């Protein structure tokens, strides 16, 4: 499913990041990086979900995970 994060999408992300030229090897690298990030956040989010004895991950679960990883997110409280 990670391959669903397509090359043109990664290119758009890089453009917003100010990147003008992009090596062909970036895309796979980016995917690995993305996966790691997602994994970490989601691992924490679900932990919160499990503590609340729920089967549904809430926006707040995610927000708390992000906060405790020093990546505070505004807008989903």
């Amino acid at each position: 499913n990670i391959q669903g994060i397509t090359k043109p999408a990664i290119r758009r992300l890089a453009r917003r990041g100010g990147v003008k030229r992009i090596s062909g090897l970036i895309y796979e690298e980016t995917r690995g990086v993305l996966k790691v990030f997602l994994e970490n956040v989601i691992r924490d989010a679900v932990t919160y979900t499990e503590h609340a004895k729920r089967k549904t991950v809430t926006a707040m679960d995610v927000v708390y995970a992000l906060k405790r990883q020093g990546r505070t997110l505004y807008g989903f409280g």
Partner: protein
């Protein structure tokens, strides 16, 4: 029920820009903001009180916490507003 700072944010907005509104997403971000800064200041004040073996959080702890958390001019103006507000309130 489910609390937020929305009405107070809107009152302030009306104070600074009478003819300006705000989107739902933007209001959500403002609420996130207020809760965030609340937590930062209250938490630092809590630690200040603990370090000094005090059981009470007073305006002095709030002020010191503000001095620790806010940069430069923001810190000075915030301290000024808090002090002014407490002085107006006391009488």
């Amino acid at each position: 029920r489910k609390e937020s700072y929305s009405i107070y944010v809107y009152k302030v907005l009306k104070q600074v820009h009478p003819d300006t509104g705000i989107s739902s997403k933007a209001m959500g971000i403002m609420n996130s903001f207020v809760n965030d800064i609340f937590e930062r200041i209250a938490g630092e004040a809590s630690r200040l009180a603990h370090y000094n073996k005090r059981s009470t959080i007073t305006s002095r702890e709030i002020q010191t916490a503000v001095r620790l958390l806010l940069p430069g001019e923001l810190a000075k103006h915030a301290v000024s507003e808090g002090t002014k507000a407490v002085t107006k309130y006391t009488s």
